[PDB]
Amino acid sequence: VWKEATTTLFCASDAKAYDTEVHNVWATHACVPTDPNPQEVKLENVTENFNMWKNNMVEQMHEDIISLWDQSLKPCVKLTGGSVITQACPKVSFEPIPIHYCAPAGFAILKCNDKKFNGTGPCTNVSTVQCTHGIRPVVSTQLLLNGSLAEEEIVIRSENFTNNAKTIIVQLNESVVINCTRPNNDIRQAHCNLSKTQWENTLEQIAIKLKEQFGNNKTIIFNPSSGGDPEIVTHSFNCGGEFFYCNSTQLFTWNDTRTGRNITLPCRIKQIINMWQEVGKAMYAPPIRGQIRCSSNITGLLLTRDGGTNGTEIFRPGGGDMRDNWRSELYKYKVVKIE
């Protein structure tokens, strides 16, 4: 049998040399062009174990996106380990592009094509691909954005559901669009709109899947974050190069027994952020002028469950470790050495 192995994965993308957007610039130097001749080969009669929670592809992508951000988005001031650095901090164009990860000679990427594959254990429908599908490296908390949807139904995955310390990665099968805007002409005030009925329907369907996992007799409750850094208490993300912190209380206050068409989340653009790359803080310059707007597909969520009786399970928005973001897309893949 061919064994899981760590190698030097390379990235591929449709990045353009003439596009000054920062993912494009990074990918122009770090990546090759998207595979012009993709080849997926079914491995007949092969069953292969996967383990999405221990997949070095995740660690490799993490280091790459750290490098992309570190090269691309310079803070004016950065504080790590009590030491301060200051530097030029130009505003940039920022819009993620899909990045593919590819295995070099001597290695193969295995892909699990089992429907509603839970991320660990045996996969009976395995293929090889030269590269992964194109993954937008979106850095965010609570909601996973612009990702890949589940094919037939919502799927929830955890390294260990019974362990309340483990994050639950939800994969939706229907996107919910969320539109976030800092209006043209308080420069730090912004907001996000999404359909109320769609979001409620989504929570209802996740709750059903949580009940499947935890017990039919359970009552499912969503509550907001219990607290911590604002990055994880809010739905935080980068739009147009600005750091948005959106109050998600309305998204995560729900019970089974029940006006307005749209949910409006209040957001703030922040200059001082806790870094995701490494432990420390960074200060960026004030927001650019003009309309700053992003329209995103919510395609997943990161949740935690309160530990323990008595018949009720409470789920709150989580995230923070961006590895779970990468994992939400890389869960069907592993790298093996051809031997």
């Binding site: 806790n274 995701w276 530990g307």
Partner: peptide, 27 residues
């Protein structure tokens, strides 16, 4: 993550602190 300061701040909130990557999460 600064786990101690995280535990420090969350304790003040009457909760435990734990890292969520490089961020502090209260439990």
């Amino acid at each position: 993550x600064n786990l101690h300061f995280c535990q420090l701040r969350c304790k003040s909130l009457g909760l435990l602190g734990r890292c969520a990557x490089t961020y502090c999460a209260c439990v």
